[PDB]
Design a protein around this nucleic acid. Structure first.
Lengths: 338, 166, 123, 167, 37, 229
RNA sequence: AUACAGUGAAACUGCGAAGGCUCAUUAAAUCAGUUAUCGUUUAUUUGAUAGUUCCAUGGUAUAACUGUGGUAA
RNA sequence: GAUGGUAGGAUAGUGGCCUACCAUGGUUUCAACGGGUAACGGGGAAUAAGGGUUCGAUUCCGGAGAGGGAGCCUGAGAAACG
């Protein structure tokens, strides 16, 4: 029975923590989950297995098979990564800290291309297949996987963009800039539709929006900042918002929904040290997930109540919530041990 | 990294038809470890016999040197504002050689009050940081090769030499 | 004389001497020029061999393109076809070398992809 | 199933071929380290407690302590892809290993009432409980090495001083 | 600006993926009557 | 598969003995197997030259150094205990290793060209030679290409021969390899063909390098004895 | 020779193998010599080369080995 | 990256070897760059033979490969015939 941290009348558990008789009652879930002293970015594929965790020094790819509970390989890529996506299964696209883009396959490293300026984010379009890559400046580029061309790059404002995302059920391209404007483009028209401005009441310094998200209803939009302040948005009276100051507030990097499992209207926010979870329409914290080290980013596995972080320590932490949901079919005795 | 050879590229004459060779062991380009701020973790890599190389990634305890007396004392790291060997490197806030990074200068306050008595001859635009706490200082040591963060403080001429820039 | 960042300075105003029959001008001993790769103050040390010839182009800065015609005793068609050679070379604070200007250079420590020679003399 | 049982302090171990799997079903879905009672595996051994310690299944494959997933999975061990059964015990174990840490209500003429001794007493001095001439010679050679080298070094440094005075 | 923004056509990505016909589960009329304002 | 310097007859074998590492280079030395076995013929094969090396008759440079492929280079005095064999081996006029026989007061020393003088660590002047005898503390006026005289009982420099115009020089290297006569000319260039030039029977002239030449004495008085014909 | 004492299957150890075939056609860029590395790595060869001490000897944890076993292996 | 400059990365270190910024350079009719084989032949690559005058001794054709590309590891030395 794994120990649980104190919270607001709710329980969470960590597996593979910094502390995790213990040697002979080990509770290790995924073997060889440890990197070279940090972690870049972890995400779980669309199907029921094959999670991918990017590397730290001699950076790797680290695909874990969930139905084998261990590592498959580690393709030591050429440069250090910041952002990537997964395109179903075996294909995936990455971009590194330099302005280069790798295409991993089953054989690995299908191509290495580049963008003219230093990039910061990448997303893929399921409809007509053009990956949009956000970079520094006036420049939000396309690499269409149909015919391998380049497209007429989207003209931005001065400094650039920290995050780009497209909406799923209808395709509304977000681009979180530096000057508080969110710069919604249309993936149909290749033109702007709106230049929504973000406001507060504290106004410490001119914050920059760093996280953008949507969900599968296509009506709301989750917004971030460089200050530790979550925001919600709708088309219904789109000028105000609801806001969420966080108790430490450095830079929120991961805001993701719970739009496919039970216990609805709930959202996860995540800044550099803490990751919390709260409810819509009130703004009150359901739980929080305080680790012993900082967080590079997180992810949430679909269908069930578990979370996978990428942090600055040697292992990665997984966080199980036995009130948000169960443990999945490949982890189907976590509810028997704890 | 990849390589160190002229065979993949053109010389001062403009030649072609390269198709040369499988690349050897001694063209070894390791990955660029952009050293950042964190908890102190140095990877001990091997090369050329027992030539251990300290590859620092998350170093903090910078030994930065008081210039006019040469007093290399221990402090922390804040962030680099200007380094146009890559203008995105200061956007991402890494820590490489010859960068100008900010330091909470509290042990330099301790040394001044310890070997001079009073608190505050030294320049005014660094006396402002003597009062406030954060002074500018440039890294000398190589954390990607020697694994260390040493540096020198900014005192007057070199201060304005960077402040007029950015 | 400071158009770039990162503390443009000598690396330990500073002054040294390679010796071996090549003078150091007084501005290159005590002057405001940095002498990063000019061998009189410099960081490089001298070695090797010393070559002499006139120039073709000095278009870019820190690029002295020497020409070097030399005699070779051809036995094939029993006449001397005339030689020509080229070598890029870094500047020195002693002479703005224009077209003509037979000068000599000493071998040291590859600076760019193709330069091992730096000017030590003008006459 | 077969049950290997070990009484460690007496040094006894024996296997018992127990059929009739509703006796066996007490161990089911209990991973390695979690204890058990004698009451639901048997009646003739009541008040018994066994810490399980793994077991090879049919096809001989071992379980390593505490992973998950009581089917077989392919891990990386002492690094190559070896097949290893999960730590949780289910219906398809051939042998299952047990350590009895408390005798209950019946003596066993294999485990309790019969025992083996140990191997042999200790060999080291501190293990039996729980040179000086070399100490002479080491110190003497060390002070002689000092009185040779650190005097000879200055003895040719003074010859450098003679060359410098004459130069 | 040499390697900066080569507007060329590249070989392995020309058929790396394949499009989808219906795509968005909404209609384009639903787009227009979604963000008229 | 042989060099020219060893005076090695061709009707010997197929594999030639590579010398092992040691004081001198590979290209300027002869090992003990090609010395003893097939030049002055104290052996007949490798087995018995290894047998006498295990018996330890050889006393090159005053130490035993029992090895078959030990690279005896220039003027290492090979000393053999039985029949008091003292052999100083120098270069002849056509490139080979002429092994002259000397006596005990001459084999009590050798000489060596100085290569570099260093302020290495902790204020210690420093000198190396072609066998690499790092001996302590010479005078400050040791230039390059001068000649120290090693003690061969301890290692100290006993005498010193200054390199200047008017000194008796030995040339080991290039197309002048192994000539004596040292005076027609002096010419120090600035990077190549720089030397002191050597006479002949009709006092002809010759060109070499600085590092390919090294001094052995004076005009008529070298304290090395030399063979004749 | 009542704490060791020779033969010695099988195990740890030191080392051994210390350089072998086929396939598509590179014009001083494959090659040979040479200059240099105070521009650099180096096992082995060789010569050299170490000065900080307040109120009789340090700890469990693994083998080989026994013993209980699984699996067609 | 064509040519160089400044700084960093990586290096065993020199090095546009790689990246940021900047300048528009550099080779060539005194043969750039490009065209092929008796490049299974040639270049001393070397031994020469007391009459064979381009037969007549050899190192090397180019780089790879251990089923196929990819990634990693070991060592004084490797992108290992193990």
């Amino acid at each position: 029975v794994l120990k649980s941290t104190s919270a607001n009348d709710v329980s969470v558990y960590q597996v593979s923590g910094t502390n995790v008789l213990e040697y002979q009652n080990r509770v290790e879930l995924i073997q060889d989950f440890e990197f070279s002293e940090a972690s870049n970015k972890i995400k779980v594929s669309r199907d029921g297995q094959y999670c991918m965790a990017t590397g730290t020094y001699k950076p790797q790819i680290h695909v874990y098979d969930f139905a084998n509970l261990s590592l498959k390989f580690d393709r030591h890529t050429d440069a250090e990564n910041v952002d990537f996506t997964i395109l179903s299964w075996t294909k995936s696209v990455h971009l590194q800290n330099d302005r280069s883009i790798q295409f991993q396959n089953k054989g690995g490293l299908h191509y290495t291309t580049r963008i003219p300026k230093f990039g910061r984010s990448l997303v893929y379009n399921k409809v007509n297949c053009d990956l949009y890559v956000g970079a520094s400046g006036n420049e939000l580029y396309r690499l269409n996987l149909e015919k391998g061309r380049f497209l007429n790059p989207f003209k931005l404002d001065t400094e650039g963009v920290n995050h780009v995302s497209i909406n799923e059920v209808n395709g509304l391209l977000a681009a979180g800039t530096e000057t508080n404007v969110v710069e919604f483009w249309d993936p149909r028209s290749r033109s702007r539709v709106s230049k929504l401005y973000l406001e507060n009441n504290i106004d410490n310094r001119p914050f920059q929006v760093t996280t953008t998200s949507f969900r599968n209803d296509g009506l709301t939009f989750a917004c971030g900042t460089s200050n530790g302040y979550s925001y919600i948005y709708d088309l219904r009276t789109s000028e105000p918002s609801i806001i969420k100051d966080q108790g430490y507030g450095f830079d929120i990097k991961k805001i993701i929904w719970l739009d496919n499992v039970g216990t609805e209207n709930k959202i996860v926010t995540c800044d550099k040290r803490i990751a919390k979870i709260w409810d819509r329409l009130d703004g009150k914290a359901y739980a929080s997930m305080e680790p012993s080290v900082d967080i590079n980013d997180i992810e949430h596995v679909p269908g069930t109540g578990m979370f996978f972080t990428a942090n600055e320590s040697i292992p990665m932490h997984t966080y199980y919530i036995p009130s948000l949901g169960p443990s999945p079919r490949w982890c189907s005795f976590l509810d028997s041990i704890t | 990294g990849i390589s160190r050879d002229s065979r993949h590229k053109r010389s001062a004459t403009g030649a072609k038809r390269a198709q040369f060779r499988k690349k050897r062991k001694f063209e070894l380009g390791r990955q660029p470890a952009n050293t950042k701020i964190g908890a102190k973790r140095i990877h001990s890599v091997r090369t050329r016999g027992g030539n251990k190389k300290y590859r620092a990634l998350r170093i903090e305890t910078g030994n930065f040197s008081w210039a006019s007396e040469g007093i290399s004392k221990k402090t922390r790291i804040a962030g680099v504002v200007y380094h146009p060997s890559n203008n995105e490197l200061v956007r991402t806030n890494t820590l490489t050689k010859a960068a100008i990074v900010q330091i909470d200068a509290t042990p330099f306050r301790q040394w001044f009050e310890a070997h001079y008595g009073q608190t505050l001859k030294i320049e005014s635009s660094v006396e402002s940081q003597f009062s406030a706490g954060r002074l500018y200082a440039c890294i000398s040591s190589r954390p990607g090769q020697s694994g260390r963060c040493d540096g020198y403080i900014l005192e007057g001429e070199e201060l304005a030499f960077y402040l007029r820039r950015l | 004389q400071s158009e770039r960042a990162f503390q443009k300075q000598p690396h330990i105003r500073w002054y040294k001497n390679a010796g071996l029959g090549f003078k150091t001008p007084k501005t290159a001993i005590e002057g405001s020029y940095i002498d990063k790769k000019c061998p009189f103050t410099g960081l490089v040390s001298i070695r090797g061999k010393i070559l002499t010839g006139t120039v073709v182009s000095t278009k870019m800065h820190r690029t002295i393109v020497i020409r070097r015609a030399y005699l070779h005793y051809i036995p094939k068609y029993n006449r001397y076809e005339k030689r020509h050679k080229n070598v890029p070379v870094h500047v020195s604070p002693a002479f703005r070398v224009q077209v003509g200007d037979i000068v000599t250079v000493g071998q040291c420590r590859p600076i760019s992809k193709t330069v091992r020679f730096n000017v030590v003399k003008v006459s | 199933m077969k049950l290997n049982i070990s009484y460690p302090v007496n040094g006894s171990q024996k296997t018992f071929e127990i059929d009739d799997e509703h006796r066996i079903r007490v161990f089911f879905d209990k991973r390695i380290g979690q204890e058990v009672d004698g009451e639901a595996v048997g009646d003739e051994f009541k008040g018994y407690v066994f810490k399980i310690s793994g077991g090879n299944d049919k096809q001989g494959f071992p379980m390593k302590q505490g992973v998950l997933l009581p089917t077989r999975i392919k891990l990386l061990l002492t690094r190559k892809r070896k097949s290893v059964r999960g730590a949780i015990v289910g219906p398809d174990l051939a042998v299952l290993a047990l350590v009895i840490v408390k005798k209950g209500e019946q003596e066993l003429e294999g485990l309790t009432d019969t025992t083996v001794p140990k191997r042999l007493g200790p060999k080291r001095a501190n293990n039996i409980r729980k040179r000086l001439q070399r100490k002479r010679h080491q110190r003497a050679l060390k002070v002689r090495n000092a009185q040779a080298q650190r005097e000879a070094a200055a003895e040719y440094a003074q010859l450098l001083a003679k060359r410098l005075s004459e130069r | 600006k040499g390697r900066k923004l080569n507007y060329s056509v590249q070989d392995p990505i020309a058929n790396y993926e394949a499009p989808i016909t219906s795509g968005y589960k909404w209609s384009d009329d639903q787009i227009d009557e979604f963000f008229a304002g | 598969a042989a060099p020219h310097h060893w005076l090695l007859d061709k009707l010997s074998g197929c594999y030639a003995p590579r010398p092992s590492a040691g004081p001198h280079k590979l290209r300027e030395s002869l090992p003990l197997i090609v010395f003893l076995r097939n030049r002055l013929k104290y052996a007949l094969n490798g087995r018995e030259v290894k047998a006498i090396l295990m018996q330890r008759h050889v006393k090159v440079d005053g130490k035993v150094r029992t090895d078959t492929t030990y690279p005896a280079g220039f003027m290492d005095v090979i000393t053999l205990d039985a029949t008091n064999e003292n052999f100083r081996l120098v270069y002849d006029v056509k490139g080979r290793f002429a092994v002259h026989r000397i006596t005990d007061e001459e084999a009590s020393y050798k000489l060596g060209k100085v290569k570099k003088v260093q302020l290495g660590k902790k204020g210690v002047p420093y000198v190396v030679t072609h066998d690499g005898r790092t001996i302590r503390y010479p005078d400050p006026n040791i230039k390059v290409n001068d000649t120290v005289k090693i003690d061969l009982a301890s290692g100290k420099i006993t005498d010193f021969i200054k390199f200047d115009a008017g000194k008796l020089v030995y040339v080991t290297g290039g197309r002048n390899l192994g000539r004596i006569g040292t005076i027609v000319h002096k010419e120090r260039h600035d990077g190549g063909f720089d030397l002191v030039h050597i006479k002949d029977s009709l006092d002809n002239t010759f060109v070499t390098r600085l590092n390919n030449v090294f001094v052995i004495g004076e005009q008529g008085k070298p304290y090395i004895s030399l063979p004749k014909g």
